[PDB]
């Protein structure tokens, strides 16, 4: 019953059980807690960022579970699992794992089960919306992009890569292999590297406007979306580019809620009419 969650998708499906945690890390952005989710998490004390969570704060909740990760909590397993009883993720984004074990721990299994049913659901009305869309041209092939200060990073696998997958998108065969090959975030320096996003349809994930460096962004965006490598790309030249995707629910939430939020704005972007 008391839980402290040391990654965006844990305290999310944690909220989504019913379970409000006594600890959480910061969020990313939005600083301390995310707007969509924030009253949510009304008296939960924030421990510490996801990268080096406080352990003490942790400590002084008492919690009877913390949930943690490999990739950000590796180095302390030892020390989290002295404080409480302590499971794990290998990522931060598989939410549908994050569900099922977090169902396990807290006795919700009926609970994840239904979230799970519900993302089921929506998923499987979304691949049959998209082919009575798209018909001969279903499945698309789909890049996720992200313009950075000195860099462009494609989202392969990872969050947003993981849900498009379910939803029957598919991938170049050049980036497919590099998914194959355990790479969920691509970064790319050189614009010889852009026929890597190639694909029928591109999805730009937009980093937080109110960033330090919104600047220096803006203008990496304006160089890559100008070359000549850009616009030889299937999408682009078919206007089947979609902008401003908010990172929040495109990436750094990782969570359960985000998911269904993430559905709902393909039908949106894409302007799929959803059939009843």
Not at 11 to 19: I, K, P, Q
Not at 119 to 137: L, M, R, T
Not at 218 to 227: A, L, M, R, V
Request: aromatic share 8%.
């Amino acid at each position: 019953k008391r839980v402290v969650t040391l990654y965006q998708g844990a305290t999310d499906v944690a909220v989504s059980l019913g379970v409000k945690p006594v600890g959480a890390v910061e969020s990313w952005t939005q600083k301390p807690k995310f707007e969509y989710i924030k009253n949510d998490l009304k008296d939960t004390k924030i421990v510490g960022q996801e990268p080096a969570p406080n352990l003490e704060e942790i400590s002084k909740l008492k919690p009877d579970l913390i949930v943690a990760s490999k990739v950000r909590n590796e180095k302390v397993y030892d020390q989290l699992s002295k404080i409480a009883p302590t499971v794990s993720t290998d990522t931060v984004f598989k939410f549908k794992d994050t569900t099922k074990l977090m169902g396990k721990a807290l006795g919700k299994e009926k609970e994840a089960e239904d979230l799970l049913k519900k993302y089921d659901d929506k998923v499987a009305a979304f691949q049959k919306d998209a082919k009575a869309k798209y018909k001969d041209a279903w499945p698309l092939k789909a890049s996720v992009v992200n313009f950075r200060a000195d860099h462009t990073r494609i989202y392969a696998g990872g969050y947003a890569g993981e849900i498009l997958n379910d939803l029957g998108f598919k991938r170049n065969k050049d980036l497919q292999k590099q998914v194959d090959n355990g790479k969920d975030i691509i970064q790319l320096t050189s614009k010889e590297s852009i026929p890597l996003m190639n694909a029928d349809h591109i999805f730009v994930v937009k980093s937080d406007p109110n960033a330090k460096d919104a600047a220096l962004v803006k203008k990496t965006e304006s160089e890559w979306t100008s070359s000549k490598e850009w616009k030889n790309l299937d999408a682009v030249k078919n206007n089947q580019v979609s902008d401003d995707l908010d990172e929040i629910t495109w990436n750094l939430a990782g969570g359960y809620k985000s998911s269904l939020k993430l559905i709902d704005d393909l039908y949106e972007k894409l302007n799929i009419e959803k059939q009843s």
